[PDB]
Amino acid sequence: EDETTALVCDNGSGLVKAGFAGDDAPRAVFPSIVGRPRHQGVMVGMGQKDSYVGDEAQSKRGILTLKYPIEHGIITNWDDMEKIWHHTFYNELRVAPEEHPTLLTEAPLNPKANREKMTQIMFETFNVPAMYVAIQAVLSLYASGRTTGIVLDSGDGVTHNVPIYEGYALPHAIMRLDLAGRDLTDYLMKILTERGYSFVTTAEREIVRDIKEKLCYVALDFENEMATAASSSSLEKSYELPDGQVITIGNERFRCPETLFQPSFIGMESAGIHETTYNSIMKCDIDIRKDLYANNVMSGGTTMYPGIADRMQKEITALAPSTMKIKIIAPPERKYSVWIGGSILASLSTFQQMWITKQEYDEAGPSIVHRKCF
Amino acid sequence: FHVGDWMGTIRTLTGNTFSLADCIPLLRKTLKDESSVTCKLACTAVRNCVMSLCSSSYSELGLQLIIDVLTLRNSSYWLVRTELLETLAEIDFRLVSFLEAKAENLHRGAHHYTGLLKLQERVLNNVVIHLLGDEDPRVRHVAAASLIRLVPKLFYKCDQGQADPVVAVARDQSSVYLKRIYRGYNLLPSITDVTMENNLSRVIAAVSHELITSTTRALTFGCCEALCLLSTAFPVCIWSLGWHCGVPPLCTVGMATMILTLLSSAWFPLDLSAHQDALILAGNLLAASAPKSLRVWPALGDRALVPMVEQLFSHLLKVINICAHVLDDVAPLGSFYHLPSYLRLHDVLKATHANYKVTLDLQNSTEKFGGFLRSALDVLSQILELATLQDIGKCVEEILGYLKSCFSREPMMATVCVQQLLKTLFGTPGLYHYCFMAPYTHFTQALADASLRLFEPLVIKALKQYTTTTCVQLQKQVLDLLAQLVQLRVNYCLLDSDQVFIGFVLKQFEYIEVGQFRESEAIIPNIFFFLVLLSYEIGIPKIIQLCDGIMASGRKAVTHAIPALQPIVHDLFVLGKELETQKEVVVSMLLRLIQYHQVLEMFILVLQQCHKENEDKWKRLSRQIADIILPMLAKQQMHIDSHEALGVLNTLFEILAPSSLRPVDMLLRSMFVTPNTMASVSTVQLWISGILAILRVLISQSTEDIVLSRIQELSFSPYLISCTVINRLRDGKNLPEETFSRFLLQLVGILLEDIVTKQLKVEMSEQQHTFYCQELGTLLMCLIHIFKSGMFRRITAAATRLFRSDGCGGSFYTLDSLNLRARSMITTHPALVLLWCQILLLVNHTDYRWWAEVQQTPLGMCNREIVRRGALILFCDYVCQNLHDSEHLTWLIVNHIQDLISLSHEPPVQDFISAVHRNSAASGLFIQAIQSRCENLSTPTMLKKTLQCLEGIHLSQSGAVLTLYVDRLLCTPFRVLARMVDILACRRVEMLLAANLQSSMAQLPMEELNRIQEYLQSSGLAQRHQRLYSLLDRFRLST
């Protein structure tokens, strides 16, 4: 065949998004979890199966202890990551990696060891002709079809911010903020406890993740919505657990995403996500700032909450000069924007010479990641 | 396959109205008939009838009869089910997958189904592997032999060779028409087909799955019989990448871990009809690890592999231990007493031995003890090769006691058990590649190289058998047991006082010459190896007097006389004054026998030693056979009837010394000859093999300059075989440029009035039609080497004044007569109508009458798309070379649009397009064609090949590629075909503004620019693609 296709995988924490390069959507999207039978089984003709990977672990949740292998964009456990990639290629996509070049995404300001060990596994585990590791935020920018913007990337791993102008990139102005979907989940199960609902274990920690994926929203003013929580009517929502227990969540619902704009609630000094965007834009040159204000791109899974775009617009407009208009461009489909940006990149004809070849790795070693790529 | 033209001639002669549309619904009905005797006779009618339709013009109706036999798979008459699978073994399922892609109503058919009509996975999972799980022993055996006939014929989708189903049919018809360790295993680098290793690994995937996930006794039992018949036609050692599943993860040990767990159960060995096929297959899967592993059992060297070999060598000494206590009525390392699992195996070898000794029937292949004792001495042999002296040194006591009792029942393979122990007791690709470009370059590369003692009780018993037996399968394995006791120097004490055994081999030469001996053929190659090897200790004076009797006084040569000397010549020429006289004797005998092509392999050995021993003696001997064989090739005495026969004679003229071929006085009087009568295809076939093998010498061994100076002296008239001279045989100032060019264009004319106008089973054979259409395949490779390589200057200009010319009043095969024969070669032989496409281009004859029939310029016949897409990859590569003629550029783009794009992964049509990007006016005509053909460029594979061809075009024509990127192709619902036409339209705007503002405004008009932006605002297309909309607003305001 011509061009050989190519393979693209996004592994921020929480979800593997994977598929062929040259398509508009990934074939396989599943949770990045390795769930191990904690309870010793007593039957004959079970499994045994040392561990379960992917949405198999979601189905068989109650037995398992679940371990996310990626925390804060950092792989904690390498064998668990290899198992997840083994699951992507053989269980879903049914590809031999020898037949495809593979793009991986990776997060900004990330330890060198993750990029270098990630390449070491791609060549010396799944034999592969070529690969690339690319920055998450630039891929979302490509997916949005814009040449310029400040990309606010927040996954389940960590929050990142990369300003770009006309292509290029500003290394000093790149900001990484330790907040995530996962930290909002840990805050959320903590704020459910005051209501009497106690979720203590990994299995129902993913149940509050599912709650937060739909019920939670961001206030267009926090204090105003917290004041109208005195007359509870629309702010309460009934939620059904898989147990058949019913949960009723009021003001507790919208103050969980409020943590992004008030990290004093989590107990971290690190500024809210709108001030981090100001911190990135202020580090940029005076000239370009006009379009960075007007071309803010949201990406990732934890920018999906209803009303985030409006809240960021009101806060950035309030802080900034009202001399210029602050447009925020946050697409629906923004969850998959990194994977789509990886699809478009590996489909680019020129990019087919910028691959890290297997040959170039075999001569010059794993350290060449940083030398060739950003 | 011309059902159109042939039916017209009959109807005006005999006025019946009978088409073949009125007989297939008469044949579709008797398949659905009630009685099970009526259904046996209608499914032999589809053995004859569905290999001829499916490659014909009626192959709409030909696919339907494949469908209905699939419903006949579950009828309960055991003769109805086994004549189904023979008409599902003779199917070519690479030609069958091609018709599915062309169908749109046939996928629906009755009741308007949605989905694909998957014939191949339904005829392989739900018949052939399914009929392995039948109850009858008759139905289980016939289904294995089809998986020997299905694996070369599968075409699973998207290999890394054949891509399309168009390219699949083209590679099985080009191999046809364009050209001591034990038996288990191999040590070669093993050159193998990459795509034939992929079809054999999907038939061993679904076969190890109805053996492990099966729930019946009948699925486990008759699928160990289908794995033993693969490994004797597709061996494991040669095709190891197909058999590989897991073990050692890289030369393989495939799937052998399941089958040992079948044998160690106490259920499965209790029936000898398929326990004897699970022992021949567990020795094929532990021997394919021998090219890897070899550097207890110290020679195995792989400790994950030793329990598989410890078990079978424990399993095969306990089954020669139950066959020793059965042939001798004795009550019950190798020991089966204390096992209760193998006391069940002693009551099953004793039921099949009470029916042999009571019922006298000697000539049975299937005996199930005589079939079972053949299986467990074949595989005790193949393991000892892996063993050493140290592992067997405690077992040379053991295995020799059992064979003295196991000698009388089957001594043919009880010495094959003894032949091996003494070894290891003494240490020892896109339809332009396939049709033309891969076979064209094996032609020109072999031309530049043409310019260049516990045995002492057991050994004495085997010699009394050879004097008294009569079966000649046993007489052949006893002459190899004695050629190993002389190499491994056992002293000549087998005959301690007398010469009893050597006197008996001399008498057997009396029965072969007269003919009083039944099967001398399978013993005469091995009689003569024993005799020459003893004389290094009957001497070589006496050995060569015996061979002279058989030849002149005895039977024919290709069984007796020619295999008689293969032991002598290899053991006399390869390996003082007494040795000089005996080499003159053996070379004189072969000159009486040059006529046979097996005698010409023995004589390539003779010429390679004289180049090593003494180069003065090397040139004397190549002159003596120069003036013998070239008088034979003109009088056609040389048996070149095979394609095994033309391969031996062309490696002879390379190795024959060029001093004996340097005068061209001899090679031309042997060339330009007429046979006696060309009535018979025994005699037409040996005259056209004398012209193909002396013409491999006039191209390599001598250039163009030497050849044509001679024919001015030798009056070789071009009326030698003319259309007046060729007609009376079938019933019964000339330039040297002009003499040699009428001889090679009227010899294309003899081979093409036969293959069209001769019957296929009347005048010729089918083995004689494998080699008659294969002499037209290597004579059109000789004509495209003379016209391309440029060393032959005078011969190229001579044909151009002849194909333009008419015949001499009808005295020659004129160029419009020769081309009517070839378009009825389209359908029977489609690989050889791609070689006639590349000659007519090469002579300056681009005549648009013949080039439209082959490309169809404005279901389908499966054997024309190899030629329709094959003559359009070859018509572009003629345009790309001399692109200065613009008359041929504007024809092929305006007419063939949907074909020009859909080939763009091919090396001759990839180069046709880049020159169009180079040319200013030729780029603008390519873009007018796609706007007419946007209605067909909507399928997802046809639109990915346009953007790689509309990628970079001329900058003067980037204003017509931006009105096509917006109006037509951007509204596709494919969101990576709306994303990849955003990369190509933003890039046209950026190179234009850094260019001149003068030439670009006349390119993209100011009135035409306002039409484009009204299309994007009423629709949502501007708000979808932001990058395209920003670049066009800055264009207007600067202008």
DSSP characters over B703-736: -HHHHHTTTTTTT--TTTT-TTTTHHHHH----H
Give yes or no for B158 touching A (CB within 8 A): yes
User: Tokens standing for A71?
Assistant: 């925390």
Q: How far apart are CA A260 and CA A222, in angstroms?
A: 12
Distance CA B827, CA B821 (A): 12
Whether residue A48 is preceded by a cis peptide bond, meaning omega within 30 degrees of 0, is yes
CA gap B657, B644 in Å, rounded: 23
Using CB atoms, pick whichever of B163, B976, B1025 lies closest to residue A22.
B976
CA-CA distance, A289 to A318, in Å (whole number)? 16
> What distance in Å separates the CA atoms of residue B787 and residue B657, rounded to the nearest whole number?
28
3-state helix/strand/coil string of B58-90: CCCHHHHHHHHHHHHHHCCCCCCCCCCCCCCCC
Q: Which residues 6+ apart lie within 8 Å of B377 measured at CB? A: B320, B406, B410, B413, B414, B416, B417
**Are B976 and A145 inside 8 Å of each other by CB?**
no
Contact between A53 and A1 (Cβ < 8 Å): no
Rounded Cα–Cα distance for residues B678 and B726 (Å) = 8
A window 217-256, beta carbon within 8 A of B = none
What is the gyration radius of the CA atoms in chain B, in angstroms? 36
What token pair was written down for B493?
């004490």
Query: Which tokens go with B863?
Result: 């054997």
Interface A–B counts its CB contacts (< 8 A) at 33
Other beta carbons within 10 angstroms of residue B560's beta carbon come to 19
Q: Which residues of A touch B163 (CB under 8 A)?
A: 1
- State how far residue A214 is from chain B, nearest Cα, in angstroms: 27
3-state secondary structure of A161: strand
Task: Give the SS3 label for residue B932.
Answer: coil
Interface contact flag, A145 B982, Cβ < 8 Å: yes
Instruction: Name chain A contacts of B983, Cβ cutoff 8 Å.
Output: 344, 348
Question: Which domains, ranges and CATH numbers included, belong to chain A?
Answer: 3-33+70-133+336-370 (3.30.420.40), 34-67 (2.30.36.70), 135-180+270-331 (3.30.420.40), 181-266 (3.90.640.10)
What's the maximum distance between 2 C-alpha atoms anywhere in chain B?
119
**3-class DSSP state of B579:** helix
Q: CA nearest B162 in A: which residue?
A: A1
A347 shares contact with chain B (CB less than 8 Å)? yes
Q: Closest to B905 (Cβ–Cβ): which among A2, A22, A23?
A: A2
Q: Is B948 on the interface with A (CB under 8 A)?
A: yes
Give dist(CA A283, CA A285) in Å, integer. Answer: 7
Cβ neighbours of residue B384 closer than 8 Å, sequence gap 6 or more: B392, B420, B421, B423, B424
Amino acid at B639: H
Concatenating the DSSP letter of every residue in A218-242 gives: --SSHHHHHHHTTS-SSS-EEEE-T
Q: Do residues B244 and B254 make contact, with C-beta atoms less than 8 angstroms apart?
A: yes
Cα distance between the two ends of chain A = 30
Of residues B948, B951, B976, nearest to A23 (C-beta): B976
Cβ contact, residue pair B975, A348, below 8 Å: no
CB distance B808 to B814 below 8 Å: no
d(CA B515, CA B528): 18
HSE-CB for A242 with a 13 A CA cutoff: 13
Distance CA B639, CA B596 (A): 5
- Which among B904, B980, B1025 is the nearest to A145, CB-wise? B1025
Q: Which of residues 21-50 of A touch B (CB under 8 A)?
A: 22-25
Four-residue CA torsion sign, B504, B505, B511, B514? negative
Residue ranges of alpha helices (H) inside chain A are 55-59, 78-86, 112-124, 136-143, 181-192, 202-214, 222-228, 252-258, 273-283, 289-294, 308-319, 337-347, 358-364, 368-372
- Sheet strand arrangement including A34-37: A52-53, A34-37, A64-67
Task: Indicate the residue of B904, B905, B1027 with minimum beta-carbon distance to A146.
Answer: B1027
Q: What's the DSSP call for residue A194?
A: G
**Using a CB-CB distance cutoff of 8 angstroms, which residues of chain A are in contact with residue B948?**
2
Provide the pairing of β-strand A149-154 with A159-164.
antiparallel
Q: What's the CA angle centered on B928, arms B924 and B933, to 5 degrees? A: 145
Please list every residue in chain B whose beta carbon sits closer than 8 Å to the beta carbon of residue A349. Answer: 951
Q: Is the minimum CB–CB distance between A146 and chain B shorter than 8 Å?
A: yes
Please name the amino acid found at residue A359: Q
Query: Residue B265 is encoded by which pair of tokens?
Result: 């159960």
Q: Do B1026 and A145 touch (CB under 8 A)?
A: yes
A349–B contact, CB cutoff 8 A: yes
Q: Are strands A7-10 and A102-106 parallel, antiparallel or unpaired?
A: parallel
> What is the SS3 assignment for B1033?
helix
Q: How was this structure determined?
A: cryo-EM
Using alpha carbons, select from B962, B958, B946 the residue that is nearest to residue B1011.
B962
* CA pair distance B520, B510, nearest whole angstrom: 11
Shortest Cα distance, chain A CAs vs residue B1030, angstroms = 10
Residue B1027 and residue A145: Cβ atoms within 8 Å?
A: yes
Helix A308-319, helix A273-283: angle, nearest 10: 50
Question: What gap in Å lies between CA B907 and CA B910, rounded to an integer?
Answer: 5
Q: Distance between CA A180 and CA A159 in Å, rounded?
A: 6
Question: How far is it, in rounded angstroms, from Cα B65 to Cα B32?
Answer: 12
Out of A1, A144, A344, closest to residue B163 by CB: A1
The chain A residue lying nearest B948, using CA atoms, is A349
Please give the Cα distance from B685 to B640 (Å, whole number): 8
**Helix (H, G, I), strand (E, B), or coil: what is residue A368?**
helix
On the CB side of B79, CA atoms within 13 Å amount to: 9
Cβ separation B1026–A146 shorter than 8 A: yes
The reply to whether residue A349 touches residue B951, judged by beta carbons under 8 angstroms, is: yes
Chain B residues inside the 8 Å CB shell of A146: 1026-1027
Which residues of chain A are within 8 Å of residue B976 when distances are taken between CB atoms?
A: 22-24, 343, 347
User: If we measure between CA atoms, which residue out of B621, B535, B534, B632 comes closest to residue B586?
Assistant: B621
> Which residues 79-108 of chain A have a CB within 8 Å of chain B?
99
| Secondary structure (H, E, C), B975-1007 | CCCCCCCCCCCCCCCHHHHCCCHHHHHCCCCHH
Pick from B185, B293, B295, B300: nearest CA to B243: B185
Beta strand pairing status for A28-31 and A15-20? antiparallel
Q: Determine, for residues A24 and B974 on separate chains, whether the beta-carbon distance falls below 8 Å.
A: yes
Tokens linked to B171: 């590679």
Whether the CB of A343 is below 8 Å from some CB of chain B: the reply is yes
Burial of B807 (0-12, 13-18, 19+ CB in 10 A): middle
Give one DSSP letter per residue of B214-269, joined into a string: --SHHHHHSSSSSSTTTTTTS-TTTSHHHH-SSSS------SHHHHHHHHSSSSGG
What's the burial of A18, exposed, middle or buried (CB within 10 Å: 0-12/13-18/19+)?
Answer: buried
Taking the C-alpha atoms of residue B275 and residue B285, their distance in angstroms, rounded to an integer, is: 16
Of residues B845, B871, B844, B839, the one with CA closest to residue B856: B871
Contact (CB, 8 A) for B836 and B871: no
Contacts of B160 in chain A (CB under 8 A): 99
Amino acid at site B58: Y
B982 CB neighbours in chain A (<8 A) are 145
Cβ of residue B1026 closer than 8 Å to a chain A Cβ: yes
Interface test with A, best of B241, B943, B979, B1024 (most A CBs within 10 A): B979
Alpha-carbon distances of B851 from B545, B836, B892, rounded to whole Å: 66, 12, 11
B980–A347: do the CB atoms touch at under 8 Å? yes
A145 vs B975: CB contact, 8 Å cut-off? Answer: no
A33: phi then psi, degrees, rounded to nearest 5: -135, 140
Instruction: For B819-887, give the DSSP string.
Output: THHHHTSTTT-SSSSSTTHHHHTTTT---TTHHHHTTT-----TTTHHHHTTTTTTTTHHHHHSTT-TT
Contact B979 A344 (CB under 8 A): yes
As a whole number of angstroms, the distance between CA B1005 and CA B1009 comes to 6
b/e per residue, A324-351, with b = 16+ CB within 10 A? eebebebbeebbbbbbbbbbbbbbeeeb
SS3 at position A204: helix
- Provide the shortest C-alpha distance from residue B902 to chain A (in Å): 12
Q: What phi, psi does B232 have (nearest 5°)?
A: -105, -5
Alpha carbon distance B922, B893 (integer Å) = 9
Q: What number of other Cβ atoms are within 10 A of residue B160's Cβ?
A: 11
Measured between CB atoms, does A167 come within 8 Å of chain B?
A: no
Distance of residue B158 Cα from the nearest chain A Cα, in angstroms: 8
Number of neighbouring beta carbons within 10 Å of residue B752: 22
DSSP string, A238-305: EEE-TTS-EEEESTHHHHHHHTTT-TTTTT--S--HHHHHHHHHHHS-TTTHHHHHH-EEEESGGG-S
φ, ψ at A239 (rounded to 5°)? -125, 140
Residue A343 distance to chain B (closest CA, Å): 9
CB A236 within 8 A of CB A249: yes
The interface residues of chain B toward chain A in range 27-66, judged by CB-CB distance below 8 A, are: none
Which of B783, B703, B182, B264 lies closest to B448, judged by CA? B703
Q: Contact A1/B905, CB-based, under 8 Å?
A: yes
Give the C-alpha separation, B893 to B926, whole Å: 6
Cα separation, B981 vs A347, whole angstroms: 12
Side-by-side strand order, sheet with A328-329? A175-177, A159-164, A149-154, A296-299, A328-329
Query: Tokens 């590996």, residue?
Result: A346
A1–chain B Cβ distance below 8 A for any pair: yes
Q: Is B976 on the interface with A (CB under 8 A)?
A: yes
Torsion over CA of B959, B961, B963 and B965, rounded to 10 degrees? -150
Which residues does chain A have within 8 Å of residue B906's beta carbon, measured at their own beta carbons?
Answer: none
Which residues 6+ apart lie within 8 Å of B890 measured at CB?
Answer: B922, B925
> Can you tell me whether residue A50 is helix, strand or coil?
coil
Residue A18 sits at the chain B interface (C-beta within 8 Å): no
Tell me, what DSSP letter sits at residue B128? I
Contact with chain A for residue B157, Cβ under 8 A: no
Q: Chain B partners of A2 at a C-beta cutoff of 8 Å? A: 904-905, 948
Q: Which of A3, A4, A8, A24 to mutate to test the interface with B (most CBs of B within 10 A)?
A: A24
Region for residue B870 given its phi and psi (left: phi exceeds 0; alpha: psi -120 to 50; beta: otherwise)? alpha
DSSP B155-211: --S--SS--SSHHHHTTTTTTTT-----TT---S-----TTHHHHSSSTTTSSSSTT
Residues 6+ apart with CB under 8 A from B976: A22, A23, A24, A343, A347
User: Cβ of A347 and B948 within 8 Å?
Assistant: no
Count the residues in chain A: 374
CA distance A107 to B906: 40
Hey, what's the torsion of the CAs at B987, B990, B991, B994, to 10 degrees? -170
